[PDB]
Structure formats: structure tokens, C-alpha cells
Amino acid sequence: QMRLPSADVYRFAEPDSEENIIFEEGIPIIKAGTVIKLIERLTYHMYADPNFVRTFLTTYRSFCKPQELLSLIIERFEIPEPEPTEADRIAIENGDQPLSAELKRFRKEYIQPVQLRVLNVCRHWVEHHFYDFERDAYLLQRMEEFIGTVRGKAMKKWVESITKIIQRKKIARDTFQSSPPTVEWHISRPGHIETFDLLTLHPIEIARQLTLLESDLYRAVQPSELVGSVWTKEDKEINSPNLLKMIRHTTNLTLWFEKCIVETENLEERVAVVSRIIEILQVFQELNNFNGVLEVVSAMNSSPVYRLDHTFEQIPSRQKKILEEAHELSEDHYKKYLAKLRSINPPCVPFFGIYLTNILKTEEGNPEVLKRHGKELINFSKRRKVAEITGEIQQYQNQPYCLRVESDIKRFFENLNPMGNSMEKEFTDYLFNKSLEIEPRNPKPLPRFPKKYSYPLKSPGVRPSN
Ligand SMILES: CNCc1ccccc1-c1csc([C@@H](C)Nc2nc(C)nc3cc(OC)c(OC)cc23)c1
């Protein structure tokens, strides 16, 4: 204990107690602690702790700023050495070499291990969370000065290693196993972008290109974008850019499906529209794009659409069953969805919405801090829980599809803007009022509306042309 530095010269060597660090229930699992005690354990002298390092660096922004973290780990690194013993003081003032038995042991067993673990944190930080340094150039400048002024022979390996990663990540900012299938076309010709629409593009190719787009959006989301509900906080655009792209696509696609349905006023044409969206669902199913399946389900369950009982009546029984089964994936807390996801073979796109729901429940169901003996301790178990949910996301992020990109169709779906200049709440009110117009509530009769589509409504089907 007293081999470690005193509190007046070093902040990371206070003894553990119930009022600064708590454990759960082998390396021990940290339940809670002060940021200082978290940093101490993040760079503990007795052993490496890769699980804690990973979980810490994913979740630390919910209790500590990047700049503050960098200051703390540098402070941890700057360990003062103990004074020479009385015999060695006498040796030094006589011009001789001191024994320095404890000093040498302390360097070997405490200073050197801790410093190596600070550099390990730096390496993991730049490798797996380089976006911190991209968003804050001053933070990177601080890291490079720190790493550049480290001195040592054991240390230089780690320095070069860390510098190696920093350069790859800067250079990044400046495939296909088999042959993919033929790109399917229906009414719209290749290049004639002005005619691209729900019924004119081939439903297979709609599902394929949306799956490519959604796969890409799924794979770009970093775990830290979900932590501490930061995508709902005021800094959402900087902290959760990829997450917000995913959410906005889902909103635009879902609301586009609804718009296509309710703005098709002719009953028989609207049946064709609903039927084509179910075919797009079928192809999402074939591709294991569960995100896409549940986007269609979401549109079909929306207030404006779900009430359109005259439309659904004409949908063939086989398509009815496909849509009904898709809904049932969501019943009993996504029981059948989860059973489906663990059974299928790659590639897939998981339903992203369920992670957000479960993370929000975890964030709202657990406190930010714990209290022991009148002192606040950061609730790290809360963060680990959230990190475990983000871990589930990550395990499906390296599943590329063997499908050819079609740049014009991709762009059409990237540029979907069903709301126009309207806000969402007012737009869904408009969709609902449209639904009341096309199929009035039960006492009123059902009026007829003229056709809007000049081209054939017959679907080309969902079986691919080899
Ligand atoms: C009654 N409206 C039927 C309807 C008209 C227009 C277009 C689509 C459809 C359509 C037919 S089945 C369906 C799917 C997506 N949804 C559902 N499926 C099943 C089996 N059960 C549900 C049970 C629900 O609450 C108890 C529910 O609440 C939203 C949705 C369910 C949607």
C-alpha cells in the first residue's frame, strides 16, 4: 500500500473503499465508481483487462468528455518516484551509485505496467474510436504531442504501433465472392429516372437496392452513437450521424409507402399498390432483410393504412398470410423475430428498431449514479448493459450482399422526401385525413375515384429471370 505514491503528489493511488468503487457479485467486474477509480482500473498495474477497456471506451462519453479522458490518462501516466532511502541518500551525496532496491522494484512492478496500460488505452482509442479525433482536431494534436514525447525502449514499440494506426485512419478519410444476379427491370427503362416509381421499377430490384442501402446504413453505425441516448440529446448531429441517417431513411421509406397507398384513391389501383409493397416484403424476406420486412409491417400498421379494410379484402390470401406472419415476428417482444435471426445464414440486415427500444428502456430503467455512504459513484453496470446490446448490433456488421448496385435506383431511394416541407406529425394527420376520404368511416358509403396510372398494374412477380 505505502509502496504506492502519496495523495499529495498523485491522485490514482487512494485505497479502495465502499465509498469510491463497487464490484459485482477471475478478474473482478466493476459495478460503479468515481471517474478517478474507473481510470485507475482502466490502467490497473496487476493485469490487463480487455473487456473493461472495450466497454469503457465505447461508453465513457456518457460520464466524461474526450478532452477530460485524455487529461486523466496522461495524469495517470505521470507517476512520481519515491524518495531514496537514508542509506542511498548517503551513497548519492558521496558520489556513488545507490542500491535503489525499492525504487527499481516500484519502476518494474508499478510504473512500467501502468504506463504500458495507458498506451494500450491510447491504441484501442485510436483503433476503435478514431471519430473522437476526427470531430476534435485539438484532441488529436494533444494525443500526438503526448505519444511523441514518450521516452523508452519498451515504450517505442507501442508509440510506433499507435502512430501506425493514426496514419491509416487519416488516409481512410482522404469484393464479391460469386457473380451477382442480373439487375431486374420492369416498366422504367435503365436511365429514364423521371419515370422511377413504386409500380414502374421491378419489385425485386426495389427490395435489392433498398437492402444494399440499408445494409450500408446498418454497417456504418458505431456503438457510441447509441450510448447515453445521445441521438435524442442536443448534440445528436455530431455524436450520432450514422444512427440518424438510419432512422431518417426508415421514416422516409415507411412514410413513402403510406403516401403511395393513401394518395392512390382508386380502390383497384390501391390494391395493386398494397400488393406490390407486400411483394417487396417477400423479397426482403428472401434476402434476410428483417429491417425492410419490419419497415413494411410498420407502414401497413400505421393509422392511415391499417384501417383500409376494403383494400386488404381484395389482397390474395397468400399475400395476406405473408403480411400477417411478418407482423407476428414482432409479437411477444419480438420472440419469433429473434428466433428467425439466430437461425438464418448470412448475409442479413437485422431490425434496427428493437435495439433502440431496448437501449432506451435500459437508459430510463437504471440510474446514472449509485450512492454509498453519501457519495455519488458512476453506474458503470448501466453502461455495460447498454454496451452488451450494441455488441449484438456489431456481430452482423460484416455481412456484405452479393448484389449489384444500380446507381440511379439507389439515388431515387436516398432522395425520398414524402413529407416535402411538412413536419411529420402534420404529415401523418394529412395521410390519415386522406385515408378517411378514400374509405369513409362505416356509416358513410364508399365513393368511387378515377384512375391515376396510365401504365399496366400487373406485377411482373418476385421470381428472378436467370
Ligand atoms: C385490419 N386492417 C387490415 C389491413 C388493412 C390494410 C392494409 C394492411 C392490413 C393488414 C392486414 S394484416 C396486417 C399486419 C401488418 N398487422 C397485423 N397483423 C396481424 C396478424 N395482427 C395484427 C394485430 C394488431 O393489433 C392487435 C395490429 O395492430 C396494428 C396489427 C396486426 C396489416
**How many domain regions?**
2
Radius of gyration equals 30 Å
Bound molecules: the ligand CNCc1ccccc1-c1csc([C@@H](C)Nc2nc(C)nc3cc(OC)c(OC)cc23)c1
Instruction: State the helix count.
Output: 21
Distance between the termini: 74 Å
Number of strands: 4
Biggest β-sheet description = 4 strands, antiparallel
CATH topology of the largest domain: Son of Sevenless (SoS) protein, Chain S, domain 2
Shape: elongated
Strand order of the largest sheet: 1-2-4-3
Measured as a percent range, the helix fraction is 55-70%
Just give the CATH class of the largest domain.
Mainly Alpha
Secondary-structure class: mainly alpha
Keywords: Disease variant, Guanine-nucleotide releasing factor, Phosphoprotein
Domain Ras-GEF: 202-441
Subunit structure: Interacts (via C-terminus) with GRB2 (via SH3 domain). Forms a complex with phosphorylated MUC1 and GRB2 (via its SH3 domains). Interacts with phosphorylated LAT2. Interacts with NCK1 and NCK2. Part of a complex consisting of ABI1, EPS8 and SOS1.
Protein name: Son of sevenless homolog 1
Write the layout of secondary structure elements.
Elements: E1 21-23, E2 30-33, H1 35-42, H2 50-59, H3 66-77, H4 86-93, H5 101-128, H6 131-135, H7 137-148, H8 153-173, H9 203-219, H10 236-239, H11 241-262, H12 267-286, H13 290-301, H14 303-306, H15 309-313, H16 317-328, H17 331-343, H18 353-365, E3 369-372, E4 375-379, H19 380-394, H20 407-414, H21 424-438
Antiparallel strand pairs: 1-2, 2-4, 3-4
The structure holds the ligand CNCc1ccccc1-c1csc([C@@H](C)Nc2nc(C)nc3cc(OC)c(OC)cc23)c1.
Domain Ras-GEF: 202-441
Domain N-terminal Ras-GEF: 26-170
Subunit structure: Interacts (via C-terminus) with GRB2 (via SH3 domain). Forms a complex with phosphorylated MUC1 and GRB2 (via its SH3 domains). Interacts with phosphorylated LAT2. Interacts with NCK1 and NCK2. Part of a complex consisting of ABI1, EPS8 and SOS1.
